[PDB]
Structure 1
Amino acid sequence: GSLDMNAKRQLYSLIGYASLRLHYVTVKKPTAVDPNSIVECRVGDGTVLGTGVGRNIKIAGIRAAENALRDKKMLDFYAKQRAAIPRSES
């Protein structure tokens, strides 16, 4: 595992729909010699699960995704969630 394609597919393909909405926030103090990149993978309801903090920007992106991908049971739960939804708000 530990790959982009696999992650983006899981999170975006497996999870994510018309409703809800999860994002990725990148925060770090990137230095010429010493680089760092954290990524907060949260969801509309304010739930953070995918936190990938690597050395560069990429590993951060792919690291965060992978972090969430570690919660397969969660991704599925969400999947059934996005489907179970009664297609409404109030």
Structure 2
Amino acid sequence: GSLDMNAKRQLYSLIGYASLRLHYVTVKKPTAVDPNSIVECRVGDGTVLGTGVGRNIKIAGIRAAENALRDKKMLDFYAKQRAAIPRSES
């Protein structure tokens, strides 16, 4: 499908923020019945910015991080947020 090389990396660069505490959640994984995995890039806000699927939690995570990363508006949203943060300790 539409998989990249450095999604979790690029994303982390794009949105990735100590305040956004973005992460990858595994909804599904490779199994005998279905050797596929699902992932959703959530954030400290408990909201899911991205969602990708792949053979494993990586390809999914990759696809997701990237997937969410593909979206600029959100990118510029989270970033703009970082700067638009009311209270920041880090």
TM-score of Structure 1 vs Structure 2, range by shorter chain: 0.7 to 0.9
Contact 2:3 2:62 in 1 (8 A): yes
What is the CA distance between 1:5 and its match in structure 2?
4.6
TM-score (norm 2): 0.74
Bigger CA drift: 32-41 or 64-73?
32-41
Matched pairs, number = 90
TM-score (norm 1): 0.74
Bigger CA drift: 3-12 or 50-59?
3-12
- Partner SS, residue 45 of structure 2: coil
Q: Bigger radius of gyration, 1 or 2?
A: 1
1:15-57 deviation per Cα after TM superposition (whole angstroms, max 9, x unaligned): 2323231110123241258410101111111111211112344
Contact 1:27 1:39 in 2 (8 A): yes
Unaligned runs of 5+ in 2: none
- The equivalent residue for 1:41 is 41
What is the CA distance between 1:82 and its match in structure 2?
0.4
RMSD: 3.0
Percent identity over the alignment is 100
